[PDB]
Ligand binder design. Structure first.
Ligand SMILES: [Mg+2]
Ligand SMILES: [Mg+2]
Ligand SMILES: [Mg+2]
Ligand SMILES: [Mg+2]
Ligand SMILES: [Mg+2]
Ligand SMILES: [Mg+2]
Ligand SMILES: [Mg+2]
Ligand SMILES: [Mg+2]
Ligand SMILES: [Mg+2]
Ligand SMILES: [Mg+2]
Ligand SMILES: [Mg+2]
Ligand SMILES: [Mg+2]
Ligand SMILES: [Mg+2]
Ligand SMILES: [Mg+2]
Ligand SMILES: [Mg+2]
Ligand SMILES: [Mg+2]
Length: 87
RNA sequence: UCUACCCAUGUCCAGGGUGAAGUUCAGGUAACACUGAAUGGAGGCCCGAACCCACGCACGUUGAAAAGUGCGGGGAUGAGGU
RNA sequence: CGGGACCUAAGCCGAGGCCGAAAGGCGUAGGCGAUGGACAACAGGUUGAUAUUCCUGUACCACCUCCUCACCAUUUGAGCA
RNA sequence: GUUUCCCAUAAGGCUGAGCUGUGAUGGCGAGCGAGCGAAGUUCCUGAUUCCACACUGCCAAGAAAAGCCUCUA
RNA sequence: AAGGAACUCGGCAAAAUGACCCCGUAACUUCGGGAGAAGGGGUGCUCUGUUAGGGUGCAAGCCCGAGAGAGCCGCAGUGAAUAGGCCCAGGCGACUGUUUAGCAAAAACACAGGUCUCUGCGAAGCCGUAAGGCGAAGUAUAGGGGCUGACGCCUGCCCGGUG
RNA sequence: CCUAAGGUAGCGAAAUUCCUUGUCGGGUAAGUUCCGACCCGCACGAAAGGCGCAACGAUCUGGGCACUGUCUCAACGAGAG
RNA sequence: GGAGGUAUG
RNA sequence: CGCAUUAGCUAGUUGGUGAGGUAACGGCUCACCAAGGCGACGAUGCGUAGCCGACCUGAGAGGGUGAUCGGCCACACUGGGA
RNA sequence: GGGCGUAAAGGGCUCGCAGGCGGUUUCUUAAGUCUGAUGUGAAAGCCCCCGGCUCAACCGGGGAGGGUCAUUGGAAACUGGGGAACUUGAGUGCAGAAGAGGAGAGUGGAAUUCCACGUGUAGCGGUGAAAUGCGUAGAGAUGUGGAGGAACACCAGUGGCGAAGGCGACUCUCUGGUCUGUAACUGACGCUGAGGAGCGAAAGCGUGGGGAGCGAACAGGAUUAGAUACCCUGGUAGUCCACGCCGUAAACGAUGAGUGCUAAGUGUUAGGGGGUUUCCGCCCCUUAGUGCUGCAGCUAACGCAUUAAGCACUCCGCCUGGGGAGU
RNA sequence: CCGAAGGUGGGACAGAUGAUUGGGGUGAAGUCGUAACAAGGUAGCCGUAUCGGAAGGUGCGGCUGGAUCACCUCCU
C-alpha cells in the first residue's frame, strides 16, 4: 500500500479533519491491504508466511466492524456500503 | 458374382429412458473451497422394433430347405448393419 | 426422367521410360472409371397393352440468325476471354 | 493473400423453407347418367420431410474434379 | 382334481413375471453404479366438469390435461394382444466386441493398460528376381516385432546351460 | 553334501489334489456336488504374471422363492397327418 | 575456577 | 441418573380458522390454511431406574441405599376396548 | 481440598465462531446480591426436654430443626442491562531501525563425478589386517576445456528473523511481522478460545521431470562359533523439482496463552535520550530481545530465580499405579 | 371410520454360539542368540521406511534424557 493511496483513503473516510483513529479510517486501510494482499497471493499461492499476515488483518477488520456495529449501528451500515462488504 | 480383409463413394438405425463434462443462479467465505438448484446433452450408456446375429428347445432329418421353420434369445449410435 | 456427346474417387490402362532368362512387371504425361459432383417441365387427359415421352394447357435450358429494336465501339478500341 | 489507415455496430449485401397473387374464363370433383356436375372454406393436430450439417457442441478432425464467378495474358 | 421338482445328468421344456403411476429399495463399490434391486400399492365406468392447469386463437371454438372427492358394476378393470421372473453364493474372463458359413460362442481371440526389444530415415520390418512399393506423404511422444492383458497391491532367487 | 540358485510374498483338495466321497464347519431327513476352513501343494506361484476385484456375461457351478403335466399318473378337447 | 557451543553365568 | 465411541430431531409435528369431543383448557381429534417448533443452557437415541419422607456412612461437603413404616405413582396371565 | 520442567499429565503451532473472563469516573435500573414481614416445608424418623414398661431395647407427650421455596416492601457497595465521559489496555497516524521471515525470477565461485585431449607409468583404492573392486585396453597423479546435479566455505557470533516446523552464496520483483520515539487521532474496540480452518522437520505415497554426491533394499569381500550387523568395494528407491496427498517427531525449554507485582551483578543484539566534544569514543539513562551468575520466594531433590519452576488473576489443554495398550 | 393381535417384506439394533485364526497375560529350573544398562564394547532414544530366526540392522531427519579428549564464548 503506497503512501499516496493511504492518504486518499484516510482523507476520504475520516470522521473529521484530524481523525486517524476512527474505526471507519482503520477499516478502510485494512480493506485495501486485504485486497492488495489477496492479489499478491493469487500469484504466489505458496507464500504461507505472508498469508498468515492476511489472517491477522482479516481478524482485525472483523473486530473493528464488530465494534462499530455495536457502538452505533447507523455508522456501521454506511461504511460497508461505501466499501462494498458483505458483513 | 460365395466368403476373409482392405480401398473409394453412398445409404440405414421406430420409439422411450438415464443424465457426464461444461455453464448459470442461489447460498457460503477475507478469498477460495464447499453446498443446493437449474441449464447442458456425454456414452464401444440402458430398454426396445426395423436391420444384423444365432443361445436353448422342439420339429424337420429319401426335408418346404444339400443348414430351414416355430417358440423364446443377443446386439440394436457403434470395434454398428448394408 | 436415367446414361453418353460434363466432372472426377478408389482402381485400371499407359506414349516415352525403369526393371526383368523369355513371357512379362512397374510406372510419368495422358486417359478410362459412379456407388459421388454438375445439370432445363409441370398439371390434367388418354390405350387392351406406353407415358414427366403421346394429346391439351402453361413453362423452362443451351445454341443459331433470313429478321426487328436499343445501346456501345471501331487500334488505351467496344466486346470476348 | 498480407500490412497500415477510415468508417460502423448500422449499412449493405449473399442466401432462404415456405406464404400471396397469377397460372385458373382451366382442370379435378360427391354423384347423376360417353356426357353432366354441387360445395370445394376455416379450425385443431402435425412430421422420420424441408429451411439445414443452419445453430450449438465434440474429437476421431471429417474426397476430388468440372460446371459457376472473377483476374489479367 | 390333490401334491408342487418327488422329474432329470441338469427345473430341459413349460409355467409363472411383464405395460403405466406411486411408495420403497440391501451387501458391496472403481462412488458412476448395483437399481426396474428387492418388496408393496393404484388402474374400469358415471357425476362433480368444455376441471386445477396448459397450447392455439382477436373471440367464439378447438385440442392437451393431472389430482382428488362422491357414486355404480363384475369372479377379475394395462378385463383382449403386445411388454423383465427374482434372490443368495462361488469359479473364469475386467468390460462392449470377435470366433470354428453347415455339431464347439466359450474360460478361447481382441481389447484399453504394462513391459521388453529393434529402428537416426534410402529407418527397422514387410512384398517383389529387380524396378517399384507398404511403412509414411510418418521421423524415436514415431514405426515394427515378442510377451502380458482393465483397475488395486505386488512381481522374489538364479547369468551355470541356451539365446 | 550338491547346485547357477535352491520357491519369497500371496494363494492352496484349486479349471491345478492321484490317494479322495481327505478332515472339520455350514447347508439337507438324507449332500461323491456346493460353501468356509485346514495344509502331506501326487504335480500352485509371481508379466506362458501372483493375489484381490465393483460393473458386465444366451459363461460354468451350488442353494432358496415364485411357478407349474417335469413328475406321482395320467385324463379330456382342438387342428395337421 | 566453573557451564554452554563447535558370548554367557 | 449414565453415554457424544448417541448430533441433529419433529410432519398433528409447531401455530392459526372452524367444527367435533371432554367434568374441563388444550392438536385432545378431524377438515382447511401457513412453515413452524425443539436442540451443544445436550434435543434425539441407547442404557438404567418406581419417586419421596427417610435409612447407612462421613468432621463436613459429600457418597451409597429407596427393605420394614408413611405419602404419591404404576401394574394385576399378555394386548386392546368399552 | 490435588496436580502437569525431570515422578502420570501443556495440545507441534497459529487464526478464530460460540462460550468464559474483562481498565477508570459518574448517573440510572434493580437480573444476580443482601435484608424486613408473611406463607409453606404432613405423620413417623434424627436432635433436645420430660414421662410409662422391674432396667435397656421399645412406647408416648411437648418442642426444636430443616428450602439456591413463594407473595409482598426496602438498601445499591459488587456483578449484569442502559446512557454520558476518561486514557493507561488495545489499535491508527506520523518519524526512524535491524533482520538466513516468506514467494517468484535470475546470476556467481569452490568442490565431487563424468566426457575429450596433452604430459606421463605401474600400480591405485581400501583396512585393525586384508580382500572384493579399478588399472598396460594406459589407470591413479598432472594441465586445459566442456557437461550436469546438489549444497552455499570464510563471514558465523548461548548472533538475527519467524507462531511453530524452519530460514545461511549474490542481485532484483512481490510481501508479512516485530522493535524504538512521538503524543496527532479512535476511546475498552481487549484476553483466552472447545468444536472448526490453516500451517506443520524427516521418512513415505501419486503423476511427470531430474539424478553429480550420498545412499534403505540388494550383490560381493572381510570379520565371526554364527554375522541376515558393525568394517570394505559397488549400489536401487530416495535425497532434488512442479502439483497433489500424508499430518507424524526427544514437533523439547520434556515448561500453554494473557496480564501485573517482586534485590542485584554481568555479557550481547536493534533503537532512543543525555553527558565533556567536529568526532572517535568513554561514562550515564532508557525500551524491547537474547545468555550467565545470584537474593527473597518456590521445589522431594536436582534446580528456577524480572526470559520464574516466585506472588497473584482470566481462559484453554491434560493427568489419576505399572502392564494389557496407543491395542 | 378408527382399531389389538396376526401375516408378508426389507432394513436397524442387541445378545448367544461357531470350524478356524490372531496376538495378550501368567507360569522352580527349557532352547537360540545378547538387544539395553559402563563409551554396554557400533552412544542411546523418537518419528518414518525397508530388511532379518529373535532380540534387532541400516537409511533420512530430530533430541541429549551421550562417555573420552582437544578448541571458542559465558560466569566465579
Ligand atoms: Mg449400447
Ligand atoms: Mg437392446
Ligand atoms: Mg437384407
Ligand atoms: Mg450416379
Ligand atoms: Mg432330485
Ligand atoms: Mg429319481
Ligand atoms: Mg428354460
Ligand atoms: Mg469376456
Ligand atoms: Mg459379449
Ligand atoms: Mg458351427
Ligand atoms: Mg452353436
Ligand atoms: Mg493371455
Ligand atoms: Mg520373475
Ligand atoms: Mg503356471
Ligand atoms: Mg513367468
Ligand atoms: Mg491371467
Amino acid at each position: 500500500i503506497t503512501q499516496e493511496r493511504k492518504n486518499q483513503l484516510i482523507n476520504e473516510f475520516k470522521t473529521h479533519e484530524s481523525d486517524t483513529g476512527s474505526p471507519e479510517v482503520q477499516i478502510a486501510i485494512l480493506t485495501d491491504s486485504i485486497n492488495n494482499l489477496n492479489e499478491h497471493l493469487r500469484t504466489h499461492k505458496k507464500d504461507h508466511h505472508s498469508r498468515r499476515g492476511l489472517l491477522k488483518m482479516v481478524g482485525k477488520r472483523r473486530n473493528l466492524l464488530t465494534y462499530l456495529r455495536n457502538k452505533d449501528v447507523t455508522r456501521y451500515r454506511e461504511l460497508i456500503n461505501k466499501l462494498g462488504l458483505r458483513r
